[PDB]
Amino acid sequence: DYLLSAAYFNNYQTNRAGFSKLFKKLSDEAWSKTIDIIKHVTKRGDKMNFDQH
């Protein structure tokens, strides 16, 4: 979701490099945390289920 906001603020009409950078950072951090949590789930002996609610 954050990646799409970063893209939107980087279109030629909006062209807000600062807003785009803010969302790109939020996106990169959330992506990195996704992998970290998956690794923690397996570290504790469980298995990741991508359809878990």
* Shortest separation between residue 5's beta carbon and other proteins, angstroms: 8
2 binds other proteins (CB under 8 A): no
- Kindly state the number of chain residues that form the binding site for other proteins, as judged by CB under 8 A: 33
Rg (CA), the chain: 15
* Shortest separation between residue 53's beta carbon and other proteins, angstroms: 11
DSSP codes of every residue in 1-53:
-HHHHHHHTTSTTT--HHHHHHHHHHHHHHHHHHHHHHHHHHHTT----TT--
Contact pattern from residue 24 through residue 53 relative to other proteins, giving x for each residue in contact according to CB under 8 A and a dash for the rest? -x-----x-xxxx-xxxxx--x-xxxxx--
